[model samples]
Target chain A: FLDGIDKAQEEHEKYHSNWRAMASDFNLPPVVAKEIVASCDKCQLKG
Target chain B: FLDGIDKAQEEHEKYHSNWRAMASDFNLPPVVAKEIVASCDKCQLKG
Candidate 1:
């Protein structure tokens, strides 16, 4: 359930430029992938 | 310029359920909005 999100975030960290792959990997809605990535402090889209 | 992302993330922290509105507020691609949220540690999609 919630663990699904942790898996998604891990993938996002290991793979930065390809959010799409993260989505497919997690069977997530494409939107969910980006949402996860954006929330990642490590990704640091900005300050 | 890059500060835009910070502003977006801040808005996301405050507004959790309405990602679309956050996107419009930041003039984002929408994808950008969700991605930002996902990447946030505080948002804590999961551990």
Candidate 2:
């Protein structure tokens, strides 16, 4: 699951989130963030 | 936000998630994962 900016992207995409921006916010890896965000659409619902 | 593993816990909680167990899996900090998982219930539905 070596997707580019996985969790970071996901959080970025999910929480009006960003890869580089949220990287530190979550203190989580950009890639790792992508995965979480990728799977969690509830966060994507703009809720 | 320094809330005892935000995203990490969230992801862990969301994904039947565990703080430590999911820490490495997501390649994300246990704290950061907490935040995402905290906000997401879609994963919690056991779907």
TM-score of each: 0.41, 0.26
Residues B1-47, candidate 1, lDDT per residue (tens digit)? 23655666664346756777777887766556666656565554443
Off by over 4 Å in 2: A1-47, B1-14, B42-47
lDDT of 1 by residue, A22-46 (tens): 7687776655665665556566445
| Model 2 Cα interface RMS deviation (Å) | 8.5
| DockQ top scorer | 1
- What's the chain B TM-score of candidate 1? 0.58
Poorest 10 consecutive residues of model 2 chain A by lDDT? A4-13
Query: Model 2, range B1-47, lDDT digits (tens) per residue?
Result: 34434434432333454445566765655445544554456543444
